[PDB]
Ligand binder design. Structure first.
Ligand SMILES: Nc1nc2c(ncn2[C@@H]2O[C@H](COP(=O)(O)OP(=O)(O)NP(=O)(O)O)[C@@H](O)[C@H]2O)c(=O)[nH]1
Ligand SMILES: [Mg+2]
Ligand SMILES: [Mg+2]
Ligand SMILES: [Mg+2]
Ligand SMILES: [Mg+2]
Length: 170
């Protein structure tokens, strides 16, 4: 009888989709190869005093899996749209992910958070102002994260749940 939220993590290869999810679930970062390409996780959390169960779908982002993207997305209630701040192509891809989500959910109003990951790095190619303005143009929150240091990780997922809760009031 507990409220469940279905989250889907999307973004280009190597942006840190899995690392962010593993930090949320296991509270660690380990840079090691893992051959799985489709993983569902369940985590019970308390957000604003309300307990819920997150079902988090984390799939590999390489283009060779692109035919499955819409089918994974179609299961989601909310989307963590991740790019890496040192990967300009991953930021350019965000527009196409947003368009695909809108198409799959048949709506211009879909719970979504833009995540700029790898903020621990000493260099970056994507300016924070550019990402903030993009998020504003979509009407979604923007959060900078590091799966390595854990900065912003809880805030990214919890903000997404808050976005779903607000959407369900409509
Ligand atoms: N410095 C730093 N490295 C990170 C961060 N997040 C992930 N990485 C590293 O970047 C690489 C890709 O991370 P991974 O979580 O596998 O990314 P993914 O988005 O799930 N890739 P795929 O689409 O192939 O499943 C790994 O070497 C990982 O350790 C971060 O916040 N900071
Ligand atoms: Mg990979
Ligand atoms: Mg992954
Ligand atoms: Mg640093
Ligand atoms: Mg909005």
């Amino acid at each position: 009888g507990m409220t469940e939220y279905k989250l889907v993590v999307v973004g280009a290869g190597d942006v840190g989709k899995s690392a962010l999810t593993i930090q949320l679930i296991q509270n660690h970062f380990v840079d090691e190869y893992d051959p799985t390409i489709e993983d569902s996780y369940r985590k019970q959390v308390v957000i604003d005093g309300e307990t819920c169960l997150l079902d988090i779908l984390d799939t590999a982002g390489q283009e060779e899996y692109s035919a499955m993207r819409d089918q994974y997305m179609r299961t989601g209630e909310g989307f963590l749209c991740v790019f890496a701040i040192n990967n300009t192509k991953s930021f350019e891809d965000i527009h196409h992910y947003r368009e695909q989500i809108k198409r799959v959910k048949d709506s211009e109003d879909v719970p979504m958070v833009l995540v700029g990951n790898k903020c621990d790095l000493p260099s970056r190619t994507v300016d924070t102002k550019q990402a903030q303005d993009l998020a504003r143009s979509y009407g979604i929150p923007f959060i900078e994260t590091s799966a390595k240091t854990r900065q912003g990780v809880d805030d990214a997922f919890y903000t997404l749940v808050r976005e779903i809760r607000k959407h369900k009031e409509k």
